[PDB]
Enzyme design. Structure first.
Site, PDB file in Angstrom:
ATOM      1  N   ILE B  25      45.580  50.236 -11.577  1.00  0.00           N
ATOM      2  CA  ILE B  25      46.471  50.243 -10.408  1.00  0.00           C
ATOM      3  C   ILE B  25      47.514  49.138 -10.532  1.00  0.00           C
ATOM      4  O   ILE B  25      47.194  48.026 -10.963  1.00  0.00           O
ATOM      5  CB  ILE B  25      45.690  50.030  -9.083  1.00  0.00           C
ATOM      6  CG1 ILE B  25      44.494  50.989  -8.980  1.00  0.00           C
ATOM      7  CG2 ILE B  25      46.624  50.124  -7.860  1.00  0.00           C
ATOM      8  CD1 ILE B  25      44.797  52.343  -8.368  1.00  0.00           C
ATOM      9  N   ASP B  96      49.688  44.475 -14.563  1.00  0.00           N
ATOM     10  CA  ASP B  96      48.246  44.616 -14.511  1.00  0.00           C
ATOM     11  C   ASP B  96      47.651  43.756 -13.388  1.00  0.00           C
ATOM     12  O   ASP B  96      46.830  44.246 -12.605  1.00  0.00           O
ATOM     13  CB  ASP B  96      47.658  44.225 -15.878  1.00  0.00           C
ATOM     14  CG  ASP B  96      46.269  44.796 -16.130  1.00  0.00           C
ATOM     15  OD1 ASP B  96      45.765  45.613 -15.297  1.00  0.00           O
ATOM     16  OD2 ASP B  96      45.678  44.414 -17.188  1.00  0.00           O
ATOM     17  N   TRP B 158      40.213  38.236 -13.701  1.00  0.00           N
ATOM     18  CA  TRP B 158      41.536  38.881 -13.761  1.00  0.00           C
ATOM     19  C   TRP B 158      42.745  37.997 -13.471  1.00  0.00           C
ATOM     20  O   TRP B 158      43.879  38.432 -13.682  1.00  0.00           O
ATOM     21  CB  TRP B 158      41.572  40.072 -12.798  1.00  0.00           C
ATOM     22  CG  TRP B 158      40.987  39.740 -11.455  1.00  0.00           C
ATOM     23  CD1 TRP B 158      39.750  40.083 -10.994  1.00  0.00           C
ATOM     24  CD2 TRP B 158      41.618  38.999 -10.399  1.00  0.00           C
ATOM     25  NE1 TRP B 158      39.568  39.592  -9.728  1.00  0.00           N
ATOM     26  CE2 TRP B 158      40.699  38.930  -9.335  1.00  0.00           C
ATOM     27  CE3 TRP B 158      42.867  38.385 -10.255  1.00  0.00           C
ATOM     28  CZ2 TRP B 158      40.983  38.266  -8.145  1.00  0.00           C
ATOM     29  CZ3 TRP B 158      43.149  37.719  -9.075  1.00  0.00           C
ATOM     30  CH2 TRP B 158      42.212  37.674  -8.032  1.00  0.00           C
ATOM     31  N   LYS B 182      34.007  40.985 -22.446  1.00  0.00           N
ATOM     32  CA  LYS B 182      34.017  41.911 -21.324  1.00  0.00           C
ATOM     33  C   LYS B 182      35.030  41.422 -20.277  1.00  0.00           C
ATOM     34  O   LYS B 182      34.694  40.588 -19.427  1.00  0.00           O
ATOM     35  CB  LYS B 182      32.618  42.021 -20.711  1.00  0.00           C
ATOM     36  CG  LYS B 182      32.250  43.380 -20.100  1.00  0.00           C
ATOM     37  CD  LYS B 182      33.224  43.880 -19.033  1.00  0.00           C
ATOM     38  CE  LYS B 182      33.109  43.126 -17.729  1.00  0.00           C
ATOM     39  NZ  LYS B 182      34.061  43.684 -16.739  1.00  0.00           N
ATOM     40  N   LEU B 186      39.692  44.903 -13.278  1.00  0.00           N
ATOM     41  CA  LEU B 186      40.937  44.850 -12.509  1.00  0.00           C
ATOM     42  C   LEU B 186      42.161  44.519 -13.369  1.00  0.00           C
ATOM     43  O   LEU B 186      43.288  44.771 -12.951  1.00  0.00           O
ATOM     44  CB  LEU B 186      40.846  43.863 -11.337  1.00  0.00           C
ATOM     45  CG  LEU B 186      39.825  44.061 -10.213  1.00  0.00           C
ATOM     46  CD1 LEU B 186      40.074  43.025  -9.129  1.00  0.00           C
ATOM     47  CD2 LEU B 186      39.869  45.474  -9.621  1.00  0.00           C
ATOM     48  N   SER B 236      33.197  34.730  -9.953  1.00  0.00           N
ATOM     49  CA  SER B 236      32.596  34.373  -8.667  1.00  0.00           C
ATOM     50  C   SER B 236      31.217  33.726  -8.836  1.00  0.00           C
ATOM     51  O   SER B 236      30.484  34.039  -9.784  1.00  0.00           O
ATOM     52  CB  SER B 236      32.478  35.606  -7.763  1.00  0.00           C
ATOM     53  OG  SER B 236      31.551  36.541  -8.298  1.00  0.00           O
ATOM     54  N   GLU B 257      31.823  28.881 -15.292  1.00  0.00           N
ATOM     55  CA  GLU B 257      33.009  28.298 -14.693  1.00  0.00           C
ATOM     56  C   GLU B 257      33.267  29.141 -13.456  1.00  0.00           C
ATOM     57  O   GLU B 257      33.584  30.325 -13.565  1.00  0.00           O
ATOM     58  CB  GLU B 257      34.204  28.363 -15.647  1.00  0.00           C
ATOM     59  CG  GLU B 257      34.023  27.607 -16.961  1.00  0.00           C
ATOM     60  CD  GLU B 257      34.509  26.162 -16.896  1.00  0.00           C
ATOM     61  OE1 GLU B 257      35.214  25.795 -15.932  1.00  0.00           O
ATOM     62  OE2 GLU B 257      34.186  25.388 -17.818  1.00  0.00           O
ATOM     63  N   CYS B 291      41.072  29.329  -9.298  1.00  0.00           N
ATOM     64  CA  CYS B 291      39.730  28.770  -9.125  1.00  0.00           C
ATOM     65  C   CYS B 291      39.799  27.349  -8.611  1.00  0.00           C
ATOM     66  O   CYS B 291      39.080  26.994  -7.684  1.00  0.00           O
ATOM     67  CB  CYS B 291      38.942  28.804 -10.436  1.00  0.00           C
ATOM     68  SG  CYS B 291      38.585  30.476 -11.015  1.00  0.00           S
ATOM     69  N   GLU B 390      36.043  29.856  -0.002  1.00  0.00           N
ATOM     70  CA  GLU B 390      37.160  30.119  -0.901  1.00  0.00           C
ATOM     71  C   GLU B 390      37.834  31.410  -0.465  1.00  0.00           C
ATOM     72  O   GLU B 390      37.181  32.431  -0.307  1.00  0.00           O
ATOM     73  CB  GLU B 390      36.665  30.234  -2.346  1.00  0.00           C
ATOM     74  CG  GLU B 390      37.769  30.400  -3.387  1.00  0.00           C
ATOM     75  CD  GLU B 390      37.236  30.467  -4.813  1.00  0.00           C
ATOM     76  OE1 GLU B 390      37.746  29.729  -5.689  1.00  0.00           O
ATOM     77  OE2 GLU B 390      36.305  31.263  -5.059  1.00  0.00           O
TER      78      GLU B 390
HETATM   79 NA    NA Z   1      45.455  46.225 -12.669  1.00  0.00          NA
END
Ligand code: NA
Ligand SMILES: NC(=O)c1ccc[n+]([C@@H]2O[C@H](COP(=O)([O-])OP(=O)(O)OC[C@H]3O[C@@H](n4cnc5c(N)ncnc54)[C@H](O)[C@@H]3O)[C@@H](O)[C@H]2O)c1
Ligand SMILES: NC(=O)c1ccc[n+]([C@@H]2O[C@H](COP(=O)([O-])OP(=O)(O)OC[C@H]3O[C@@H](n4cnc5c(N)ncnc54)[C@H](O)[C@@H]3O)[C@@H](O)[C@H]2O)c1
Ligand code: NA
Lengths: 500, 500
Positions: B25, B96, B158, B182, B186, B236, B257, B291, B390
């Site tokens: 998306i 992206d 992401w 990996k 998103l 997260s 992290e 972060c 957060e």
């Molecule tokens: Na995207």
């Protein structure tokens, strides 16, 4: 003769909140010889709070923010005090855990040795602060501060009671942390006596707190406490999992020193009596209760027969008795539970078709105590329990090989990867096998010798992280990056509001 | 336009076994613009086996046991390719993940810069092998070997798709590991393009495997795979907890992290425009999805009114548009779910009695896309959700102070401890506040700038371990102690069998 103590919390002795206590058993006689306090969560809560305060008290000036040289003096004084009480401490160790007295004496020298080692690291620490980081821009500067990780919980095993505690306590204190030490319930006497030494040294209150008790009651709550910054653990893989599991809920850093199934590989080009002595030391010393025990003999088939003949002869000279007896070279295992578990390992290997070359049961001449003969199990097959599982007793199994490649394959044939050893006069072959070993510790032309100066830890299913050496200290320091904008120019990324 | 790719496994493109795919998306437009392969356990199984084989193949001579200068050349070649494809890669990143194109261009520069940095570190590593450990006995010699940790799972978020992947991939490859990456479902486009770059560079097959897909389907199997030596993770805290929980079952090392609630402290003695810009960069840059974002402003009461007035003026000048639009300084947030989550934080802050000084909803002039105006929330009380949780969007909350001591207590009033920032012309005050911050990263007279040369990581609830710098390389290296008995004398611990 055996001291009666409370928990050591905030610089002084303190009864457990619920006032429970547990037996002390002498493994050599099976008699109850006293008791130790049994801490619960409410004791952990008090100890943790005391640790917190010890770090913040007086702007941290007495411990946390003091210079390394200040902490170093405390650690040298603890070392001298241990050396002073050596004869008593070694005897309490042998009584409590069952290791030969000559072993306990060695342990006590190394406790003092460890504190002194980390005292010297503490003095060097001050000059290590504000380490410049070189940057590819002259508009920023950056450096590193090394701060105490904070409040640490230290959970230790019984095979080397005082020494295991020390391996964690010395660097943690050197780094400026405040510790809650939770020793094994099977051997807490010498760790409690560490309390007294803290009192006598005047170590600031709350800097070291010793909580004895059951693992789930006294250990477990360290891994689930918001104010504990790190748990450092040595013991079983199973208990490691549980502690790591629990710590995850608060994303708490955990370091794990676990067991293994370490290989010793013996090639043909060696003096048989030297290699025979190292093999015994590798599997039977500490009454076989060595995490890094070379409990798998990988023996070149050309010498199999005569090596096994020699090793059996050496075994026959091993005096097995009460640990306090002069010349003792093997004591009882730590407890009834382990005694019965070890023998079950021996009978299971019998039930699976392996041969007991020598040993296999208690010795005839000792009627009381948890004594087991040094056992060698042969005709062993790769899929047998004895080959794969950690026994943690005076039990060695033997498989044979012809090629270096086959020896390596058998060596790395395990889910664990703590220790490994190779014995060969051919030194280039030693190095080759060294590199091929999937282990954190490799011994060449020996097995087991452990130096404070050198990093200690496992790969694969033997845990992660290194203790001892400089690694030991770094486990208790948190790294702080300090990056400073020194340009007088605006950042100039966003558009400024027009003037007027 | 948007490339169509398979998984990258064992040096070549390979369809998921169950051939599932998931949409891409555009956050700016909300249109489906393509798709990415969705990996499952059976693809992880294939990728892991491929990584294993890659480490052992030709006795590790191509990669794992090759010298560092060999891996360096591969890393420099990847760096050159990234630079060559910068315009396309930056545009792909923006489409992206939604970050302004000028930010994505900066990311891509640093991707290349990171590979080059770790190439330099890979070279230096050869000289760091066989480091001697100094022993207090002339009868033993000891040294350390630094070997690849093995098969690593690298799981990334992401907000910096390619750069976050690189922070892990570069050191891991420099260390001679073989990696399974990996990326976030998103934003996987640029990471898949890393696949193509590996093909073009001739990186040995299996050394880097890129597995796109859903967290529980493609990421999770990494943490439960007996053949994965280590998992390195950024994302997260909740996902961190889950990975750490799973890995504990096989007692597998994990590095985390995680997020935070990082403070910026601004004292009265500062240039208001410079301080205003840095506060904006600290909370609204990368669309607030940092972060280490300084999402809590701790502002001196004497300048509060006029600081907040200036910052609002600066905010009004922030051009918010499609990320590809010239001069864009704020793009849309990554996704619908994130969009709605952030607006809920703003309304919950209103429901609790806080004031919305500026922003609070989508911009009027943009009818489509997950855009949110830079938001300043004031009249904030410490128990409010906005203060403690957060947000991960362009939302800043403000609190006032008068004393340095109050500012520190406010700064450390959090379960987290990733970043922190102090702005004051009084440099000695900066140093005092730096030392007092419970954080892994401290910025002086700025907020957010991040260098590959410097250690990066949090304390408290913000995770553990450090990435970047030399720390980054050490995360992928196992330490092997090699201790060798060099005396010809027998160990002499045990009584030898009598000579006849
Ligand atoms: Na995207
Ligand atoms: O062999 P061994 O018995 O010494 O190894 P072990 O792993 O059972 O014990 C090692 C140490 O961990 C502690 N421990 C045991 N269970 C625990 C738990 N559930 N949570 C926290 N700590 C625990 C023990 O009391 C001991 O101090
Ligand atoms: O981005 P964000 O805010 O969602 O952060 P997040 O922590 O959910 O995501 C960070 C990374 O972790 C992965 N992940 C998510 N759930 C997982 C699970 N159960 N097991 C393993 N990996 C998982 C994601 O796909 C992503 O690549
Ligand atoms: Na005992």
């Amino acid at each position: 003769p055996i001291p009666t103590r409370q928990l050591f919390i905030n610089g002084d002795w303190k009864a457990p909140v619920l006032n429970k206590r547990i037996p002390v058993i002498n493994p050599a006689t099976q008699n109850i010889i006293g008791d130790i306090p049994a801490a619960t969560k409410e004791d952990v809560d008090v100890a943790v709070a005391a640790a917190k305060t010890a770090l913040t008290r007086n702007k941290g000036a007495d411990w946390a923010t003091a210079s390394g040289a200040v902490r170093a003096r405390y650690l040298r004084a603890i070392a001298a005090k241990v050396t002073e009480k050596k004869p008593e401490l070694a005897k309490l160790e042998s009584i409590d855990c069952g290791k030969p007295l000559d072993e306990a004496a060695w342990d006590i020298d190394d406790v003092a040795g460890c504190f002194e080692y980390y005292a010297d690291l503490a003095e060097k620490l001050d000059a290590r602060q504000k380490a410049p980081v070189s940057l590819p821009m002259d508009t920023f500067k950056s450096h590193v501060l090394r701060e105490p990780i904070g409040v640490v919980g230290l959970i230790t095993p019984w095979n080397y009671p005082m020494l295991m505690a020390t391996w964690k306590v010395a660097p943690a204190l050197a780094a400026g942390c405040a510790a809650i030490l939770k020793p094994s319930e099977l051997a807490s006497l010498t760790c409690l006596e560490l309390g007294e030494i803290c009192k006598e040294v005047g170590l600031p209150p709350g800097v070291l707190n010793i909580l004895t008790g059951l693992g789930p009651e006294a250990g477990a709550p360290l891994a689930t406490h918001p104010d504990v910054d790190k748990v450092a653990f040595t013991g079983s893989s199973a208990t490691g999992s549980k502690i790591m599991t629990a710590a995850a809920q608060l994303v708490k850093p955990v370091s794990l020193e676990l067991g293994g199934k370490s290989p010793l590989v013996v090639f043909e080009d060696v003096d048989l009596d030297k290699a025979a002595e190292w093999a015994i030391f590798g599997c039977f010393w500490t009454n076989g209760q060595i995490c890094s025990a070379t409990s798998r003999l990988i023996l070149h088939e050309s010498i199999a027969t005569e090596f096994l003949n020699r090793i059996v002869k050496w075994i026959k000279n091993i005096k097995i008795s009460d640990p306090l007896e002069e010349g003792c070279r093997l004591g009882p295992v730590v407890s009834e539970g382990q005694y019965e578990k070890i023998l079950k390992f021996v009978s299971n290997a019998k039930s699976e078709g392996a041969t007991i070359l020598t040993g296999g049961s208690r010795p005839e001449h000792l009627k009381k105590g948890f004594f087991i003969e040094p056992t060698i199990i042969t005709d062993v097959t790769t899929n047998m329990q004895i080959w794969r599982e950690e026994v943690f007793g005076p039990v060695l199994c033997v498989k044979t090989f012809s090629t270096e490649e086959e020896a390596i394959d058998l060596a790395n044939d395990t889910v664990y990867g703590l220790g490994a050893a190779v014995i060969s006069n051919d030194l280039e072959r030693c190095e080759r096998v060294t590199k091929a070993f999937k282990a954190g510790i490799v011994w060449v032309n020996c097995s087991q010798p452990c130096f404070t100066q050198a990093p200690w830890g496992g790969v694969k299913r033997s845990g992660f992280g290194r203790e001892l050496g400089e690694w030991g200290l770094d486990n208790y320091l948190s790294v702080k990056q300090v990056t400073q904008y020194i340009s007088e120019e605006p950042w100039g990324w966003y558009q400024p509001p027009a003037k007027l």
